[PDB]
Every structure is written in C-alpha cells, then in structure tokens.
Design an enzyme around this catalytic site. Structure first.
Site, short mmCIF file in Angstrom:
data_model
loop_
_atom_site.label_atom_id
_atom_site.label_comp_id
_atom_site.label_asym_id
_atom_site.label_seq_id
_atom_site.Cartn_x
_atom_site.Cartn_y
_atom_site.Cartn_z
N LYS A 113 0.85 -1.20 0.00
CA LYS A 113 0.00 0.00 0.00
C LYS A 113 0.88 1.24 0.00
CE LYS A 113 -3.68 -2.50 2.26
NZ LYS A 113 -4.98 -2.37 2.95
N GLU A 148 -0.22 -8.64 5.10
CA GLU A 148 -0.66 -9.95 4.68
C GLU A 148 -1.72 -9.84 3.59
OE1 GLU A 148 -3.81 -13.14 6.87
OE2 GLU A 148 -3.15 -11.43 8.10
N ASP A 200 -12.90 -9.31 -0.12
CA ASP A 200 -13.52 -8.50 0.94
C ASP A 200 -15.00 -8.88 1.13
OD1 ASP A 200 -15.11 -6.80 -0.70
OD2 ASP A 200 -13.62 -5.46 -1.04
N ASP A 256 -12.90 3.54 10.89
CA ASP A 256 -13.42 3.51 9.54
C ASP A 256 -13.72 2.11 9.07
OD1 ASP A 256 -14.29 4.63 7.09
OD2 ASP A 256 -12.26 4.35 6.20
N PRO A 285 -17.44 -2.72 4.80
CA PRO A 285 -17.26 -4.04 4.23
C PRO A 285 -16.00 -4.17 3.37
CG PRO A 285 -19.58 -3.48 4.25
CD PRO A 285 -18.81 -2.23 4.65
#
Ligand SMILES: COc1cc(Br)ccc1CC(=O)O
Ligand SMILES: COc1cc(Br)ccc1CC(=O)O
Ligand SMILES: COc1cc(Br)ccc1CC(=O)O
Ligand SMILES: COc1cc(Br)ccc1CC(=O)O
Ligand SMILES: COc1cc(Br)ccc1CC(=O)O
Ligand SMILES: COc1cc(Br)ccc1CC(=O)O
Length: 289
Positions: free
Chosen positions: A33, A74, A79, A120, A123
């Site tokens: 990220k 990881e 999701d 925050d 899903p």
C-alpha cells in the site's frame, strides 16, 4: 525489483493505491500500500506491528524511502463487500453471519483493550479467506493519518458506517465508533442492503434519524450541544428493529439495538457483545466462495 515483484494492481484504497506484490526474499504474496502523501505517523504505525491478532490483517512492514511511505500487509483474496454482492440472490447464511460478527467482535475486543480504534470499518476493509475467517484491515491507520478529519483517497469517502457522534462533530473518538460501524455491517449482512446509505453528511444523518428517531437529550445527554447539532433538524419517531432487519431473531435484534444506541456511552462494548445470547449457538462454517 530489489525487494518486491509487482503481481497486479488491487485497486484504489482509502489511503492510496494498493498492489499485490511478491517479496523476493520470502516468496510470499503481500498487499503493498502506497500512502498518498509526518514522522509522527511512522512511529504510530510502526507500533501497530505489535497489534497482532488472528482477526486483524497482519502488518508486515513500514517502508519510508524516497520520501514515500509504503505499508506491507498480509494478503487475502476477497472482501466482505464482494462476498455480499456475490451472495445477494440468497444472502449470506445466518450461521456464517453469526460467525463473521463473532470474529469481528473478538478482533475489536482485542484492539479496544489496547485503546486502539479503527474509526473507519466498512465491508471493503473486512477481508475473508476460503475457510471461514474474517479479518479487519487497516486497523489503527486512521488515528495515525488523522482520518476521518483528513482524506487521502481519490474515491468518494463512504459515510454509510459513520457513527452519529462523528457526523455531529464530536472532538473525542471512543471505542463506540467501531461498534456502531459493525452494527451497520451486521444489518447489511442480514438484509442484503446497506442500512444507512447516505450520499452526504446530512443525508447520512437524516437516514439514521428516520430509522432510530431524531436524537434528543432524553436518549443522548449533551447531543444538543454538539458542534454540528441543529435544533431545526426534523423530528422523526423511532422505527422498531423488527421492521429494519427482518428476519433476524429477537436475540439478534436486541444485540443490534445495543450496537446502535445513540449515546456512545450506552453502546454495548465488544467484550459484552461476545457474551450476548445471540452467540449461544455460534459456529465457524465454510463460505460458498
Ligand atoms: C516499496 O518498494 C518500492 C519503492 C520504490 Br520508490 C521503488 C521500488 C520499490 C520496489 C522494491 O524496492 O523492490
Ligand atoms: C516500481 O513501481 C511499482 C512497484 C511495485 Br512492487 C508495485 C507497484 C509499482 C507501481 C508501478 O509499477 O507503476
Ligand atoms: C483497494 O482497497 C482495499 C484494498 C485492500 Br488489500 C484492503 C482494503 C481496501 C479498501 C479500502 O482501503 O478502502
Ligand atoms: C505507484 O507507485 C508505487 C506503488 C507501490 Br504499492 C509501490 C511502489 C511504487 C513506485 C512509486 O512510488 O513510484
Ligand atoms: C434462516 O435464514 C436466514 C436468516 C437470516 Br437473519 C439471514 C440469512 C438466512 C439464510 C440462511 O441461513 O439460510
Ligand atoms: C480515480 O481517479 C482519480 C481521481 C482523482 Br480526485 C485524482 C486522480 C485520479 C487518477 C489516479 O491518479 O489514479
């Protein structure tokens, strides 16, 4: 090429772009990220390498190089948002909803015991594997980066899971904000449709108000002195949860009610929720995906 092999772009996350990569030393696949840009954030995030739990996506590394910041996590393949969409004709089965909620509450209870909030949950940052586990992603990043006051993403920020105290301008973020979000997610798994899909802060607030009634000093002491409280808000009466989340049983509806109390101090804790009678028959099923 020195440290990582790029595999593919995962997408645009809450903090920036996310790639699937392969660590050249370990051979493992990871979520890499890039934070879309302080020193303070790096210290805070680096401490999250200690905040390890089976229901928290594991933080592997924090990289500050060439004045850019990268987090290594990881990797998980799917999701909850995608799984709900794939499950939409049938719904996620109730035993799996219950398993998913129980596990998420275990992860929250652990983090909350260390006084770390998510702030925050949604899903799209609840990740699942093919055996029945679910994990909270990006836990503790929002305090380090000043979310939700600050925005990093290129996407519209999703208000649907925001606790009412945040929407009303509160200064102080308690563990209750995460219980609220999880309650909204629970309702969504049951009904197959977001509970409060607001498309602006006022639409978010009015959707909450129409379902739970406009909050007042009776249910929530001090609410009328919140920074963004307006005495001119319309006054809606509360709806019964029996209309909101059918066909959930009364144990589930009671639990949900407690997760969605207006006053954050009255909101059930994660540890208390784990003891709720709704979980008497909890199990750990295998998902169909
Ligand atoms: C966080 O990783 C990078 C950051 C920059 Br700038 C360039 C290349 C990489 C990959 C590597 O070092 O293999
Ligand atoms: C050197 O850049 C990357 C390295 C890795 Br690992 C992942 C993603 C990129 C961005 C790109 O390829 O544009
Ligand atoms: C591309 O977005 C994600 C990627 C990964 Br891996 C985890 C969570 C998200 C959602 C978000 O950060 O909002
Ligand atoms: C979008 O670029 C990246 C994204 C990731 Br994840 C890793 C490394 C890069 C290269 C760069 O920062 O130039
Ligand atoms: C008893 O049926 C449900 C009740 C609730 Br609430 C949610 C989902 C289902 C589907 C199933 O579990 O098959
Ligand atoms: C979803 O696309 C964007 C939205 C905004 Br605001 C800025 C830039 C982009 C493109 C990108 O640099 O990926």
């Amino acid at each position: 090429m020195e440290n990582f092999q790029k595999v593919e772009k995962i997408g645009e996350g809450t903090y920036g772009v996310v790639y699937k990569a392969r660590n050249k030393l370990t051979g493992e696949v990871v979520a890499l990220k890039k934070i879309r840009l302080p020193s303070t954030a790096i210290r805070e995030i680096s401490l999250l390498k200690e905040l390890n739990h089976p229901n928290i996506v594991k933080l592997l590394d924090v990289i500050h190089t060439e004045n850019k910041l990268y987090l290594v996590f990881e990797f998980l393949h799917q999701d909850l948002k995608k799984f709900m969409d794939a499950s939409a004709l049938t719904g996620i089965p109730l035993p799996l909803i219950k398993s998913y909620l129980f596990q998420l509450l275990q992860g929250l209870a652990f983090c909350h015991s260390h006084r770390v909030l998510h702030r925050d949950l949604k899903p799209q940052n609840l990740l699942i594997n093919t055996e029945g586990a679910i994990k909270l992603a990006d836990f503790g990043l929002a305090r380090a980066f000043g979310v939700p006051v600050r925005t990093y993403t290129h996407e519209v920020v999703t208000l649907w899971y925001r606790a009412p105290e945040i929407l009303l301008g509160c200064k102080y973020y308690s563990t209750a904000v995460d219980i609220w979000s999880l309650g909204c997610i629970f309702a969504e798994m049951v009904t197959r449709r977001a509970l409060f899909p607001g498309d602006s802060e006022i639409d978010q607030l009015f959707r909450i108000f129409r379902t739970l009634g406009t909050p007042d000093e009776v249910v929530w002491p001090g609410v009328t002195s919140m920074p963004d409280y307006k005495p001119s808000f319309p006054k809606w009466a509360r709806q019964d949860f029996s209309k909101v989340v059918p066909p959930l049983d009364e144990d589930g509806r009671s639990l949900l009610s407690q997760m969605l109390h207006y006053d954050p101090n009255k909101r059930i804790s994660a540890k208390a929720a784990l003891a709720h009678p709704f979980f008497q028959d909890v199990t750990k099923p295998v998902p169909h995906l």
